[PDB]
């Protein structure tokens, strides 16, 4: 199927003392594989998946140099942004950056992206053409003119379409045992009486990968959203994900209701009904 490589960076200023708290994480699809935390002892980029431990010392040295350089850029930016917005030196502020690349089933470049936020709001982002910039406000418009003059988008486009895709294909091969395996949802239904004449039916999807999934309820073959609850997809903690969807029904009428599960790991969607003897 399709794949992605994405890096996420967060810097939080600490004006009372010291440098910003900085956390970087790298993902292939929904699998975290590297991390950096300015508060951790190593002061190195660290592995978080078995297939990245295959990389030698030159890889770790290179990634550590790049991530520390990113942390210093964020430290400088927090100062510049405090000035652009006429903010006090006393408050804590945040910068967030995400970039990466998507490939299709043929492992060829599909799209690239590079987004930046200040205090949780869009600041500046590269457009899908990988040439242009979207500036949210006049401070970001100043940054946009600066980056047009410095050929920034050209350098980013070269990385996103080239280097990024080359690293992603390498990781997909080295980590094939897990990265190229889809784990279909393990499904079951539970029943929870809410009175002597109504009950909640809860349709569970467990231990699935990747995280993308759709759970829908139908009543007599048509979509049902009234009296339903759908929780956000959540990590199990072992690399897989979970989700559930529930509906309140009149007791005795459970067979009218079906839960429908769609996931990349299921050739055809699954349909579940409550087993009334349970």
């Amino acid at each position: 199927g399709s794949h992605s490589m994405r890096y996420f960076f967060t810097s939080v200023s600490r004006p009372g003392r010291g440098e910003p708290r900085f956390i970087a994480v790298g993902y292939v699809d929904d699998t975290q594989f590297v991390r950096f935390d300015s508060d951790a002892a190593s002061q190195r980029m660290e592995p978080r998946a078995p297939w990245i431990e295959q990389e030698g010392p030159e890889y770790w040295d290179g990634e550590t140099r790049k991530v520390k350089a990113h942390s210093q850029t964020h430290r400088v930016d927090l100062g510049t942004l405090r000035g652009y917005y006429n903010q006090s030196e006393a408050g804590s502020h945040t910068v967030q950056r995400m970039y990466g690349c998507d490939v299709g089933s043929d492992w060829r470049f599909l799209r690239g992206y590079h987004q930046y936020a200040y205090d949780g709001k869009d600041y500046i982002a590269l457009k899908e053409d990988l040439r242009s910039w979207t500036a949210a406000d006049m401070a970001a418009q100043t940054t946009k003119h600066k980056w047009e003059a410095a050929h920034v988008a050209e350098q980013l486009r070269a990385y996103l379409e080239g280097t990024c895709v080359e690293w992603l294909r390498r990781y997909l091969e080295n980590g094939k045992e897990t990265l190229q395996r889809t784990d279909a949802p393990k499904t079951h239904m539970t029943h929870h009486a809410v009175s002597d004449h109504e009950a909640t039916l809860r349709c569970w999807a467990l231990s699935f990968y990747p995280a993308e999934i759709t759970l829908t309820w139908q009543r007599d073959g048509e979509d049902q959203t009234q009296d339903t609850e759908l929780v956000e997809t959540r990590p199990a903690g072992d690399g897989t994900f979970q989700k559930w969807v529930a509906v309140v029904v009149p007791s005795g009428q459970e067979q009218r209701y079906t839960c429908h599960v769609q996931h990349e790991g299921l050739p055809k969607p699954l349909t579940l009904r409550w087993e009334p003897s349970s």
Partner: peptide
């Protein structure tokens, strides 16, 4: 692998 591009706002 990460990008080496340094662009300050």
């Amino acid at each position: 692998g990460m990008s080496r591009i340094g662009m300050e706002v």
